[PDB]
Design a protein around this ligand. Sequence first.
Ligand SMILES: *[C@@H]1O[C@H](CO)[C@@H](O[C@@H]2O[C@H](CO)[C@@H](O)[C@H](O)[C@H]2NC(C)=O)[C@H](O)[C@H]1NC(C)=O
Ligand SMILES: *[C@@H]1O[C@H](CO)[C@@H](O[C@@H]2O[C@H](CO)[C@@H](O)[C@H](O)[C@H]2NC(C)=O)[C@H](O)[C@H]1NC(C)=O
Ligand SMILES: *[C@@H]1O[C@H](CO)[C@@H](O)[C@H](O)[C@H]1NC(C)=O
Ligand SMILES: *[C@@H]1O[C@H](CO)[C@@H](O)[C@H](O)[C@H]1NC(C)=O
Ligand SMILES: *[C@@H]1O[C@H](CO)[C@@H](O)[C@H](O)[C@H]1NC(C)=O
Ligand SMILES: *[C@@H]1O[C@H](CO)[C@@H](O)[C@H](O)[C@H]1NC(C)=O
Ligand SMILES: *[C@@H]1O[C@H](CO)[C@@H](O)[C@H](O)[C@H]1NC(C)=O
Ligand SMILES: *[C@@H]1O[C@H](CO)[C@@H](O)[C@H](O)[C@H]1NC(C)=O
Ligand SMILES: *[C@@H]1O[C@H](CO)[C@@H](O)[C@H](O)[C@H]1NC(C)=O
Ligand SMILES: *[C@@H]1O[C@H](CO)[C@@H](O)[C@H](O)[C@H]1NC(C)=O
Ligand SMILES: *[C@@H]1O[C@H](CO)[C@@H](O)[C@H](O)[C@H]1NC(C)=O
Ligand SMILES: *[C@@H]1O[C@H](CO)[C@@H](O)[C@H](O)[C@H]1NC(C)=O
Ligand SMILES: *[C@@H]1O[C@H](CO)[C@@H](O)[C@H](O)[C@H]1NC(C)=O
Ligand SMILES: *[C@@H]1O[C@H](CO)[C@@H](O)[C@H](O)[C@H]1NC(C)=O
Ligand SMILES: *[C@@H]1O[C@H](CO)[C@@H](O)[C@H](O)[C@H]1NC(C)=O
Ligand code: NA
Lengths: 749, 747
Amino acid sequence: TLPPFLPCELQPHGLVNCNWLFLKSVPHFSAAAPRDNVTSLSLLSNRIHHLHDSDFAQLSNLQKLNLKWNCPPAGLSPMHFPCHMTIEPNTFLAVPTLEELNLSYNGITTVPALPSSLVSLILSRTNILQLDPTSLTGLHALRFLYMDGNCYYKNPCGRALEVAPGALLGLGNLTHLSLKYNNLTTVPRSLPPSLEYLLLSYNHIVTLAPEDLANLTALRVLDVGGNCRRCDHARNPCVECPHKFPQLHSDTFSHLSRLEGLVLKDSSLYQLNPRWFRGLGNLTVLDLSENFLYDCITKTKAFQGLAQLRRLNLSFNYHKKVSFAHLTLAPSFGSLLSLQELDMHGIFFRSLSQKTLQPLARLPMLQRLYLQMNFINQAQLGIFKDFPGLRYIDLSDNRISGAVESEDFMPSCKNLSFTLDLSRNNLVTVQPEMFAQLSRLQCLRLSHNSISQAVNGSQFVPLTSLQVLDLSHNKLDLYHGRSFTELPRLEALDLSYNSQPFSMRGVGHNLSFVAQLPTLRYLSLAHNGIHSRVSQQLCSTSLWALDFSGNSLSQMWAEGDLYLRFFQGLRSLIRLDLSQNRLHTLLPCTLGNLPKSLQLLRLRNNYLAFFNWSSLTLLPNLETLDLAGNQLKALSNGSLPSGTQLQRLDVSRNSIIFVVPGFFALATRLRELNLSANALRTVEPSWFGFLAGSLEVLDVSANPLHCACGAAFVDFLLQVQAAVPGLPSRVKCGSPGQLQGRSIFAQDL
Amino acid sequence: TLPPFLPCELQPHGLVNCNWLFLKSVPHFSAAAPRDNVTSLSLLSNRIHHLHDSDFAQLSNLQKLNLKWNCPPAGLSPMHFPCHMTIEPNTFLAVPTLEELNLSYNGITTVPALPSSLVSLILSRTNILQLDPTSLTGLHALRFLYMDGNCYYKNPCGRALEVAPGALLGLGNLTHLSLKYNNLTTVPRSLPPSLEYLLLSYNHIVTLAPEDLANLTALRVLDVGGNCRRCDHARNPCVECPHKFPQLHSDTFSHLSRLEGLVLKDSSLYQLNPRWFRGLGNLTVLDLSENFLYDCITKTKAFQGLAQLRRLNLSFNYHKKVSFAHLTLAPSFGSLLSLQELDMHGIFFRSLSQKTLQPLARLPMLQRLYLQMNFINQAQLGIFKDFPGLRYIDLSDNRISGAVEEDFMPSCKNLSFTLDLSRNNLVTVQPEMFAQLSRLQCLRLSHNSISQAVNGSQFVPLTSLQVLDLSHNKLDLYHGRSFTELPRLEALDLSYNSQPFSMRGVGHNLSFVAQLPTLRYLSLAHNGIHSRVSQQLCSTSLWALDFSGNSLSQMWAEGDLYLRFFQGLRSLIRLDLSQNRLHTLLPCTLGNLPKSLQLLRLRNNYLAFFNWSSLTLLPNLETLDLAGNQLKALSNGSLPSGTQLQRLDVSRNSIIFVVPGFFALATRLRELNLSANALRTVEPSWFGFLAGSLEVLDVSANPLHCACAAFVDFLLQVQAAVPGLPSRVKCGSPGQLQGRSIFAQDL
DNA sequence: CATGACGTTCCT
DNA sequence: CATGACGTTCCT
Ligand SMILES: *[C@@H]1O[C@H](CO)[C@@H](O[C@@H]2O[C@H](CO)[C@@H](O)[C@H](O)[C@H]2NC(C)=O)[C@H](O)[C@H]1NC(C)=O
Ligand SMILES: *[C@@H]1O[C@H](CO)[C@@H](O[C@@H]2O[C@H](CO)[C@@H](O)[C@H](O)[C@H]2NC(C)=O)[C@H](O)[C@H]1NC(C)=O
Ligand SMILES: *[C@@H]1O[C@H](CO)[C@@H](O)[C@H](O)[C@H]1NC(C)=O
Ligand SMILES: *[C@@H]1O[C@H](CO)[C@@H](O)[C@H](O)[C@H]1NC(C)=O
Ligand SMILES: *[C@@H]1O[C@H](CO)[C@@H](O)[C@H](O)[C@H]1NC(C)=O
Ligand SMILES: *[C@@H]1O[C@H](CO)[C@@H](O)[C@H](O)[C@H]1NC(C)=O
Ligand SMILES: *[C@@H]1O[C@H](CO)[C@@H](O)[C@H](O)[C@H]1NC(C)=O
Ligand SMILES: *[C@@H]1O[C@H](CO)[C@@H](O)[C@H](O)[C@H]1NC(C)=O
Ligand SMILES: *[C@@H]1O[C@H](CO)[C@@H](O)[C@H](O)[C@H]1NC(C)=O
Ligand SMILES: *[C@@H]1O[C@H](CO)[C@@H](O)[C@H](O)[C@H]1NC(C)=O
Ligand SMILES: *[C@@H]1O[C@H](CO)[C@@H](O)[C@H](O)[C@H]1NC(C)=O
Ligand SMILES: *[C@@H]1O[C@H](CO)[C@@H](O)[C@H](O)[C@H]1NC(C)=O
Ligand SMILES: *[C@@H]1O[C@H](CO)[C@@H](O)[C@H](O)[C@H]1NC(C)=O
Ligand SMILES: *[C@@H]1O[C@H](CO)[C@@H](O)[C@H](O)[C@H]1NC(C)=O
Ligand SMILES: *[C@@H]1O[C@H](CO)[C@@H](O)[C@H](O)[C@H]1NC(C)=O
Ligand code: NA
């Protein structure tokens, strides 16, 4: 049975996904298709420039419709091609069940007629420059109206968006209104008092008064940021904001008793008026980033009594010309008893001392502290010892150099109690004194420093709780046998991208320390170019995962018998990545020397042109084998051996032309098979002994299928269509003639 | 007309190249083949296990025959498969013109009968474990005999190679003998006195006496290294050599009056007996590397008076356990008046001072000094000011951190004075380090840890510096006078300084480029430049800019800010825009590249469309590299008229068709790469049936449809321009022809 | 026959 | 029916 909505794909929850199919018109599906079951129709980024009364009328129960990016205005078109989208009068009225409509990134200049069922309407990046009471007539259920970006540098219009006074008052249920990037100079008058979210950023609203927020006492979030910009900080085209601005009335916000979030970023503020925050008893999030508040934060009383604030962003409040020698936060920060997160990155100050953050030092709920990108060159990390709630400190991208004068292979630190990021700093050695008061730390990131030390067990002595240590992207000289032995709780160690020492031709290195790390579970030695003069064996009874990608096992395993048991003493290993090791050849003997406990083996992006399948019996616990990106020319030379517990096999991006009958048939636990990006001209059920119904994933995309009438693959792919990703569109013909590059369904074979 | 020696390829100077064709037997070429043109036949790395009397018998002018790697011994086989090569009695006698034979990496246990014309014979990595007077009968013209590696860890045999006393004396013209890796314990007796090169390294010859070199007074090179090894330094399996060894006689070499080169590397030497080198009046090259000579070199008189010596290698004479605080070379080094090159890398000493190298400092001819990998942490670079001859110092891979308490980027090989300080521990650059190095023309500082905001103060003394390599550092580029203190600067490598450009929210500034009035070559490659940078690069001097590995994608999406970024490079002729994540181009932004451009690389982007007509905006463009993009056709108009384009690379795209006449108006086109696309045909119509001016047309790695097709006749017509035509141009279809050469069958 | 096309965007 | 095969090796 054909996919029911060709050329589109039926996805869960009644979604017909027609995205990125280069359609010039809305598909008309068969009277035989289950049109009644379609609840969402996605037409993202097709080339539909004309919508008709008939387009959606046969989808009797359509609730959600996405027409984004079909006819982009010239400014947003990659080639600046103009586009005007025409819409027949009843296009959307013909869908009286429609609840959500996305019409963004289309060249339309007026709002079409819309059914009164509508709950959510997105008209952003269109060319609609006016809203009046007739524009959205009858939409009494509308909760969300987003119309951002109809007049700005990427979509210019030569004037302001004009929203007539009271234009939206008929929208009695409207809770969310966003009108960003519309070249506004004033807040539209008499907006719906139902509003909870009003987003007016990146216009030119440079004066704000309580009258501009009349009757909006239901507001939970107000964003007026980016209206009076500091263009020194801009990454994009930026209009200068004259120095008399902004002009905020002291009582602008005082009636917004329900306000939870206020965004005043990128407003050229040199002053905080405490009166702005005084009526705001429910305020939990305040964004003051990208202002000129560097001196203000040393003295302000504006945080006095804001004992409910949870998140405060003061990032990029930097002085144009300078960094500060010292920075001392105002006493009023000590009032912020609910504060959980403080972002102070990008301010630029040279010293972090006890005085710097003293008012924060007893805040009981302060969990996250962002101090990155501050050009700090002296930091007393001991200041943090007694912060009672700290989970996470980001001190990355600083110039600290010492004491004061995927997850299957490497876990993240997100679930840990206390994490310090000192990555992208200027350490060349590690001295334990810098860590003396950080014994509570569970995770420490030191990646991308300049550490060139021969570590030896003396560096990390204070770090008695440390579980995870990231030393990636340094120059550690590994040879001392007691490296990292001073870390009693170390479970994960990342030594990836420490290749320089290993590249020193003729100088030996030593990985015997690995055996002396009794709790180590995850290790990376990836991208180190390890290739000669190293330990003959890695040993560990604890290790579960080893990333050895990006080395030269090719060289090592060509060196007589020296390295043939390199991984064998990893007696508990379950995951091993040998990708990108320049392997042109393996031995069965060498595969039988990997740990018997192995469950997952990656050999991606090597140069293997032959693989001895029968050797898989030497890894009885193997579940996943990844051979993607090698040079296999066939799946032959026997077939997958019996008794295999293999569940997942990836042979994508090889050069496979042929698979022998039965190749996969004895791998009774096989569930996921990737054959994508090979040279297969057919897909044969005989490869599976005609028992392919247990597969959950069978990816045959990017193969030169021969689209002749009655090829095996047609019927077969239909039989296992639930397993084949992208079947309707991404499974293409290589031949014959004009079918090359087309879907196998472009024609009925 | 078919290629004349299918399945092989005819190459220049009468070479028939049959390499890597998986052949199981020597080809018998067509009846009409021009066999008298075959002066060399290469059969490297096929799977020919049986050679026959008739194999080479019709090749009447054959001079050179390469059969290497056809039947490797088990130890050398990638899978340890055994192989024995059989050779019929007259296989080579049938070629009385044969001068050079390579039989290495084949499982043979005896030497075949060979023609008396033979000049060179390579029998290495075979299983021949004896040579007797009957092994090489009648080869009176033989000058070279290489038989290395017939008994060692990769090809074991369980005994020594046995060369009978006087076995080779009938080789009256023999000048080169190599018998390395053969498990020898003594030098074979009574070797030919004609010998000039005798190579005996990596055996177990641990005693050497003048009698072991009897009558070999024509020797120019003797290599006995690696016979008594230090296994601590070994990268491979290594047999420890008992401490009583080696045993050399004081006069072992004294009769070798013509000796030019002597190799005593990896011999476990703790002593140098000056008598070894006295009387070697012609000695120019001495290799003493990988011994234990670290104390010996501070005191030895062994170099006293060795006035002819030009090259001395003392590398990796390190102490097992330690580095030395100081190292002082012996006074005798001051007598090496001919010395041109001294290799002292890998000895391990912490300080380089005036005293360290004092004996070298007046040697008039000393040009190259190798001091890398020494763990040096203090270096007074001013010591070098007054060395009269110095061209090149390698101080890479050390721990120096400051003063003591090609068409895109030229190399420094032609300059007067180059210092390599790459892979050191600089975090800033202080001018004082360089105060006495004003003469330098090239300075390499790659792979240090330099994190400074350069500002025009760093390099003040370097008033002759032409080339400066700062790749692989963390330089913060924003000061407007960076590098302006270098008045001769012509080439600057700032590649791989990505960390600062990766600081999201923090701006950088490239305006200093405009202030470098002699700059010709600049690399900003692999910097991840993507936002908050100068809107324009400006230079009237620059010829070449490598901007590969950035994010012009992001920059050119940012309204109009960066649309003129390269336009002010008013003399630019080469630009690399590869790997910039480009999914699209504007025609107007290609027309904002300098009109002077000759070469534009756009490799490894994600371009699925290209507006060919935009090429008229670059009137001087000769080379366009679009390899590794996502083009699905060559269409959308042709190459425009008037183009000077000579070279076009569209390899590794997804091209499935080319419109008729696509290439026809590109009258200067000479080189076209279509490799690794999805083309099922090759059509002369693409060229308007005028493809004869092409010098290179690469159509390899395309799924050609091998039906009884345009391409067949066409490729034979332009065969001189098609690389690898006999073997690497393959069928995608139909049926069993998939993956075979288009010549595997007659289409 | 006042319209196509480009292309995984968009963010600031 | 005492043999094939693997592969761009080899270096120390
Ligand atoms: C099968 O393999 C292909 C290609 O090897 C996968 O496609 C890639 O997917 C990864 C992440 O999963 C991306 O990083 C690549 O950029 C994709 N490239 C292409 C060309 O598609 C594909 O996802 C795999 N299939 C499944 C079901 O996992
Ligand atoms: C045509 O293009 C192909 C592929 O893009 C070239 O093949 C590559 O050549 C370079 C060396 O120049 C190697 O680094 C790659 O590994 C090669 N890959 C393959 C698959 O061959 C080919 O050399 C080009 N042809 C000519 C005549 O220059
Ligand atoms: C809001 O919408 C609901 C339907 O979702 C409707 O029943 C209710 O009457 C509407 N209220 C107003 C004020 O329009
Ligand atoms: C914004 O409006 C002003 C004044 O009407 C106009 O000059 C300017 O062109 C407009 N900006 C844009 C991007 O269209
Ligand atoms: C605010 O609402 C009151 C009645 O609730 C009305 O009198 C007044 O006009 C409203 N203000 C605006 C600006 O719409
Ligand atoms: C929060 O807003 C409510 C209305 O939702 C108001 O009654 C209350 O006073 C506010 N809370 C505080 C602490 O002011
Ligand atoms: C480790 O090295 C440091 C300095 O490099 C040194 O002080 C300490 O003694 C060393 N520790 C050991 C165990 O050798
Ligand atoms: C590696 O270091 C260990 C010290 O734990 C030592 O026993 C061993 O000999 C060294 N091995 C190599 C190959 O350097
Ligand atoms: C593996 O199979 C291929 C054909 O699919 C064949 O050419 C080759 O000889 C086989 N190799 C082995 C070792 O059996
Ligand atoms: C050496 O070879 C030459 C030709 O290259 C030959 O004429 C001469 O007789 C040979 N000499 C000896 C001593 O065999
Ligand atoms: C070298 O010869 C010895 C003694 O005859 C023998 O024991 C050894 O196995 C040989 N070595 C090799 C690599 O065959
Ligand atoms: C060295 O040459 C002389 C004759 O020139 C000969 O008598 C003697 O046997 C030779 N020595 C050896 C070891 O062959
Ligand atoms: C450059 O920076 C150094 C410190 O690295 C400073 O001493 C010097 O004065 C600065 N030079 C200029 C020209 O600003
Ligand atoms: C770069 O510096 C120059 C002055 O040297 C200044 O004109 C320009 O604004 C700066 N550009 C950026 C992007 O910072
Ligand atoms: C480019 O050519 C392709 C045919 O290969 C065509 O589909 C596409 O519409 C053309 N684009 C333009 C801009 O002409
Ligand atoms: Na253990």
